[PDB]
Amino acid sequence: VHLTPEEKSAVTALWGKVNVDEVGGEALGRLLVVYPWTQRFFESFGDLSTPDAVMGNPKVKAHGKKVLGAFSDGLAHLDNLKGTFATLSELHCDKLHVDPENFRLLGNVLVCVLAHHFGKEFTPPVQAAYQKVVAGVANALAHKYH
Template sequence: MVNWTAEERAVISCIFAKLDYEDIGPKALSRCLIVYSTQRHFESFGNLSNASAIGNPKIAAHGIKVLHGLDRALKNMDNINVAYTDLSILHSETLHVDPDNFRVLSDCLTIVVAAKLGSCFTPDTQLVFQKFLAVVVSALGKQYH
């Protein structure tokens, strides 16, 4: 279990309140697929052979779904591991997703959020945001341990 200060909770809530999920989600997932070549888990999403193809509606919809999936962590900050148990099992046992993909997606999400928030995304804000994402990544990878 992670201990969150009131300030950290406020920072996380503030970040997510400023995000346009329909903009940020697709951009983060597309960036991940382009930069890290993680397409093998998305074969049913159509042609992903180049950057313009990766920007398809199925990828955009999944990016939005992933970002909304972080709402679960926001609502369960005191017990993120339990909140993500079913998703961890799904991704490990059914989908066989490499758990490192969660980390690279969190890196891409950090980049996209930083670009969107600009000067509001200070190093202190980034520290809290990445702590939050690290806890989510660990929870999603829990089934692999």
């Protein structure tokens, strides 16, 4: 990650516009629809009889604040991602061992949740300055893999 306080203050200010209070739970419930084959790791959620059983799950709501939360932690300290993502990566590498070909997706899904609930802000400069930012997380949770 590496942007100027001007282009970063926008993708960073969108945090308020985003109700992380739950928007983090809808981001995962969607990643499953566009990619439900990941039923190997989400096997813990148990409740998964039908796509609707996911949004009805109580953990997905609280678990959403954890996923979208780790992201807000970076914007709150981009001084070093691998520094804080040292546990998530180690916990996601040896504990969950999530294939590295997945984060690149959760990044294209969340963005869609913003352009939809906030399309009046998907300005060109706000998007380009949105990939290289979270793009560091995709690798952060993969820097401990190799």
